[PDB]
Each structure stands twice: as structure tokens, then as C-alpha cells.
Amino acid sequence: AMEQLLRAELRTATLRAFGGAGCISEGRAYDTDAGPVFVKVNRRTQARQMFEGEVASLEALRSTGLVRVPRPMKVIDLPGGGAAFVMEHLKMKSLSSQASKLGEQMADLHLYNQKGSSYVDKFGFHTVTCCGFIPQVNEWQDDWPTFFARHRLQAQLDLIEKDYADREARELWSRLQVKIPDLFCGLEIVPALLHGDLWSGNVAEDDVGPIIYDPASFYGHSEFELAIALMFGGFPRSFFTAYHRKIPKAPGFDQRLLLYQLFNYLNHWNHFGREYRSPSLGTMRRLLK
Amino acid sequence: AMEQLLRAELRTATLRAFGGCISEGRAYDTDAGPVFVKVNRRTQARQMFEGEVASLEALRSTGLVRVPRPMKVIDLPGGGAAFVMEHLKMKSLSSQASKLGEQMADLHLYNQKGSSYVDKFGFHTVTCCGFIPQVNEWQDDWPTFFARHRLQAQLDLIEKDYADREARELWSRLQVKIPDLFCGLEIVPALLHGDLWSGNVAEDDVGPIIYDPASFYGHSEFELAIALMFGGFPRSFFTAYHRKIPKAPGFDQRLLLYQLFNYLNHWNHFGREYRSPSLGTMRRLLK
Ligand SMILES: Nc1ncnc2c1ncn2[C@@H]1O[C@H](COP(=O)(O)OP(=O)(O)O)[C@@H](O)[C@H]1O
Ligand SMILES: Nc1ncnc2c1ncn2[C@@H]1O[C@H](COP(=O)(O)OP(=O)(O)O)[C@@H](O)[C@H]1O
Numbered sequence A: 001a002m003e004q005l006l007r008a009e010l011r012t013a014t015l016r017a018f019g020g021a022g023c024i025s026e027g028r029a030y031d032t033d034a035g036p037v038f039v040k041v042n043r044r045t046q047a048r049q050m051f052e053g054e055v056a057s058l059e060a061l062r063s064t065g066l067v068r069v070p071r072p073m074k075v076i077d078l079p080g081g082g083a084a085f086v087m088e089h090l091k092m093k094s095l096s097s098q099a100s101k102l103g104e105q106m107a108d109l110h111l112y113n114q115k116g117s118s119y120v121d122k123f124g125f126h127t128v129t130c131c132g133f134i135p136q137v138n139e140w141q142d143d144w145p146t147f148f149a150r151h152r153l154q155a156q157l158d159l160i161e162k163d164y165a166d167r168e169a170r171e172l173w174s175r176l177q178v179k180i181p182d183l184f185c186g187l188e189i190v191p192a193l194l195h196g197d198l199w200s201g202n203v204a205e206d207d208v209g210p211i212i213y214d215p216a217s218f219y220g221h222s223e224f225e226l227a228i229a230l231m232f233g234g235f236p237r238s239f240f241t242a243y244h245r246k247i248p249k250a251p252g253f254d255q256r257l258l259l260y261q262l263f264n265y266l267n268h269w270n271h272f273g274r275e276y277r278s279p280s281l282g283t284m285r286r287l288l289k
Numbered sequence B: 001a002m003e004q005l006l007r008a009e010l011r012t013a014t015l016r017a018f019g020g021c022i023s024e025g026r027a028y029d030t031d032a033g034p035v036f037v038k039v040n041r042r043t044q045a046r047q048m049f050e051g052e053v054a055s056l057e058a059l060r061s062t063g064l065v066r067v068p069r070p071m072k073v074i075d076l077p078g079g080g081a082a083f084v085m086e087h088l089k090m091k092s093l094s095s096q097a098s099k100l101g102e103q104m105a106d107l108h109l110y111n112q113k114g115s116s117y118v119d120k121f122g123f124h125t126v127t128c129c130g131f132i133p134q135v136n137e138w139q140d141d142w143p144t145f146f147a148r149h150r151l152q153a154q155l156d157l158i159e160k161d162y163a164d165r166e167a168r169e170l171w172s173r174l175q176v177k178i179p180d181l182f183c184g185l186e187i188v189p190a191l192l193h194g195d196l197w198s199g200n201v202a203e204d205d206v207g208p209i210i211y212d213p214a215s216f217y218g219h220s221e222f223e224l225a226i227a228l229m230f231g232g233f234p235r236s237f238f239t240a241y242h243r244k245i246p247k248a249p250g251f252d253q254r255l256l257l258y259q260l261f262n263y264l265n266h267w268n269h270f271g272r273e274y275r276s277p278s279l280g281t282m283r284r285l286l287k
């Protein structure tokens, strides 16, 4: 898509995405006596909490045996604030040929909780995981639209009120809250373990297959995983084809997709500022149309 | 340092870095070279990128500082635009800091010294500081340009979006005091990068690099305010710079005025986290 436009506008046969590293933290690879390691540094005061949530997320994904992610090694307090997180170094290129395989794996990951050796019947998580540098509440809830409205959308919009005092966001949210249960089409939603931040910048591949990293995990609706993948692009079509061969789109998928993308726009407004006010409000208005 | 801390916590004799964003775009390997692509999906994207292209071109024309070469601005289906530029292998500014200090002082001296002389403050097109378009209307007088097209623009947005009483009253008092900071000094228009914080500078094996400009002709000292206020520049950058352009009398108080602009811009971009520094800087200017 964007790659097709670039190939045409620039006149290139090939086009391979590549590549301190990251938007939240600084990341560098080091060679050590025991092997290569990768180290993320964040100087903010909440850094340890963020990295401990990433450690818990990595451990939950690794326990499934369905996807490859870096092994977490150590979280280290930094003099003068913040923390460093050391993990296994992985040789990686951007996701291309392994996209359909990753689609299969992410669908199996979401379906894992329905396997007989998994018993999680509520939405949430056993510990705090951060969306970027913003701590999230993962308090267990039986009802997914309640969990998502309260501990994702409302939490972001309360931060928008505090920091931006945005009248339009407040007024639109009140109207949207009324609509949210209708978007679920009377469906029974079952918990699915999510990577939680499956942007194209957080997936990659090597010669064995795809790799994913930087998770912010919780038990959620499987569909929420795909919203960030779709809105910022970067995943080949074959990723989604393989995924939906295993988990078909339930009724109302397209409208829930807007609701889940809304969360990501609000989170980008809080992290990155007013640039993201227009898509946030615009998505709310589209849901209310 | 952190490297010693890592050596100790991991219990390793060696710790050898290898392998060497900001909510922009991605790098792509292309048949004709590597390229770097910035994506902005909003409707104002093209205008913003055209300002960046114009800023990069004005800086490139001096031949004094290395910037990425702009290639193409492309309209995106479904809104916004992509900006393709030459890819540069880039590391954080350290060993080339002193060189960058020299080059930025030469950049600021280029206008008065060259043969074609821009004799007003402003720019020939709109350039954005971050995501906010600036008015660059030519003005003979720098305190007028800065008060109207930088400080007042920001404070009008703060009145609109926050209705902040304290900002309003402090501005009423501060506005009158601004000329005192400039009396008895000659101000010559100087081409500025316009957004020289530490995250917009880098280096490679050949020398320093600067990028993401928001250029205009301004007072040279304004350039340094964001560099100082958010840190990240080695002392040798400022030492080299001020060997060529020493601090004129009143430098520290003008520095507060210029940092105020940046605090207000951060309040408009990121919200009330920056209200306290904005108001506080105003109070320091009024003491
Ligand atoms: N375990 C790892 N080994 C090697 N490289 C990594 C590893 N994890 C991440 N990377 C590289 O670092 C980049 C950013 O990492 P990420 O964990 O997404 O940081 P952030 O939370 O700051 O966005 C990735 O694009 C990838 O190239
Ligand atoms: N021309 C380029 N070549 C290679 N890397 C680049 C180039 N431009 C930017 N980058 C990378 O992107 C980062 C942010 O670039 P910037 O232009 O400041 O984007 P933003 O507008 O999102 O802040 C830089 O620190 C650098 O690592």
C-alpha cells in the first residue's frame, strides 16, 4: 500500500524497511562475555514499573510456546532516576516473508485461552502493564465492554481532561459511552491473551520465522490486537488473511475496529500531543454518525 | 556510568556496543540508495512538509551544515502526506559537538556576511514549530516579530484552549518589559534552524548533522534557548559557538524570554504539564 506508492513515486523495484531505538525508550545492543544482550533505558520515574510490566508480558507470552519473544533478564535501577531493562538479543529484520506465519501464530495465541489447560475467565491481568509510559489498570472484570470502557477509554479521556481540558473530547465521550454496548452485537466475548501493542514496529523476523517484542499484555477481546496493526499499516495482507482463516470476523467487526483504534489515537494524544486530537475526535464522531 | 553499571549487574568483563522514529516514519532500502520517509496522516501534512523542505533548502544553500537532502513530498490516499529524504546513518551528537558549535555560529553569521542580505526578520513561507504553523510575516524589528508572531500567537492559543487567567495577566505585564531586554544592542537577521533541541541533531563519521528544522530569520540567540533548556548538548558545543559569537550583554534575561516561547509551545502541544514552567518563566522575567 504505502510501499506500493513509494515504489511508484520513487521508481524502485525493491523496498525493504529497516531499523538508540524506539519512541518510548532508548535501546542498544551490547556484546558481553555471556552473549549479546539488548538494553532499553528510560530515565522517567515510572520506568521500573513499565519494564516490570513488560517482563510480566514477555513471560506470559513465552509460557504459551506459540510465539518467539526475547527472554527478559534484568531490570536495573539507574542513579538519578529511571531504569534499564536487559533482555536477550535477537538478530532481526523487518517482517516480510514471515507475515502469514505470524498471522497464524497470533490467531493461535488468541485461541490459547480456550485450550483445556487455560482457565482465565475474566478480562484484565495479574499486574500493571504500561501503554507506552502510561500505567494501565488491569483489574479483573467479567464483562469486556465494561473493562475496555473503564480501564482503557475512560482512563485515557480522564488524562486528556486533566492535561488538555478538551471540551469536544468530553462531550463526544459522554455520547459514545451510551453507544458502546450496541457495538458488541449481543456477542459473548471470551478472554484472549494479547501482545497488546502489535504495531508493525514491534514485529520482525529472522530465518526461523517471525518474532514479536515490546508487549503490554492483558486478557482482552482478540479483535483489539489488530486495531493498531491496521491503523499504522506495515503488515502484509497475508498476515490478516492467515489470521482470519483461523478467527473469522464476528458481526460488527468494522465498527469495533473504530472503537479500538480510538483507544490508540487517545493514547497517542496523551503520549505525543495535539497532533492526535483530530483523529481522536474524528473517530468518535464517526462512531456517533 | 551506565556502562559500568551494566558491566557490574551482568558480571561481564566486556560490554561492546554494536548495531548502533520520534513518531515520524521509517527507513527503507531502495534501489537508488537508502531513503528515510516521514509520514503524517493529518490534512495539514503537505503544508508542514513543504515548510520543512523550504527550511532544509535554505540551510543547504549556505553549505555550512549537513542536513538530509529532501527528495519528494507525496500525497497519501486517505489523508496527509509522506516526505522522502536522503537517508543518513546517524548517531547522537558527541565527538562532533565542537564542530557543530562552529558551524551553527557560521550559519548565524552567514546572512549579514554574505552578498545577498535578508534585511528583515521572518521567512518567505510558513514553517511549523512541531505541529503548529507559524506566521513568518517580514518585520523590520526583532522584538516586534518575536512578541507578535511567536509569543502572542502561543498565548492566544492558550487563551482559546485553556482560558488561563494567570497567563493572560502575566502577559499583560511582560509585554511592556520586552524592549528593555533589547535596548542598546544591534540585532541582525540570522538564518536559524529554528528547533535545535538535542533530539534534532546527530553525527556520522564525517561530522555533525541537523534535521527537522523550522527555519526563519531571527535573533541568533533564540537558536540556543531550546538547546540549553532541554539539555543533551556537550559543553564544548557552546564553547565553540561562543568563541565565534560571544554572549552579548543581557544574554541571560533574553535567554529566559526565548525559553518562555518554547515552554508555551510545549504547553500548546502537550498540555498543562508545561503550565508551571511557562508561568514561572514569566514570573522570573517580571522580578
Ligand atoms: N531483544 C532485542 N534484540 C535486538 N534488537 C531489538 C530487541 N528488541 C528490540 N530491538 C530493536 O529495537 C527497536 C525498538 O525496540 P522497542 O522494544 O520497540 O522500544 P520502545 O518501547 O522504546 O519503542 C526495534 O525496532 C528493534 O529493531
Ligand atoms: N534523513 C534521515 N536519515 C536517517 N535517519 C533519520 C533521518 N531523519 C530522521 N531520522 C531518524 O528519525 C529520528 C527523528 O527524526 P525527526 O525528523 O526529528 O522526526 P520527528 O518529526 O518525528 O521528530 C532521528 O533521531 C533519526 O534517528
Ligand SMILES: O=C(CN1CCOCC1)[C@@H](O)[C@H](O)[C@H](O)CO
Pocket (backbone or CB within 6 Å): A023, A024, A131, A132, A133, A197, A199, A228, A232, A264, A267, A268, A271, B022, B023, B024
Ligand atoms: O509508540 C508506539 C507506536 N506509535 C509510535 C509513533 O507513531 C507511530 C506508532 C507504541 O509503542 C504504542 O502504541 C504507544 O505509543 C505506546 O508507546
Ligand SMILES: O=C(CN1CCOCC1)[C@@H](O)[C@H](O)[C@H](O)CO
Pocket (backbone or CB within 6 Å): B129, B130, B131, B195, B197, B226, B230, B265, B266, B269
Ligand atoms: O518535540 C520537540 C521537543 N520536545 C519533545 C519532548 O519534550 C522534550 C522536547 C520539538 O520538535 C519542538 O520544539 C516542539 O516540542 C514540537 O514537537
Ligand SMILES: [Mg+2]
Pocket (backbone or CB within 6 Å): B022, B199, B200, B212
Ligand atoms: Mg524531531
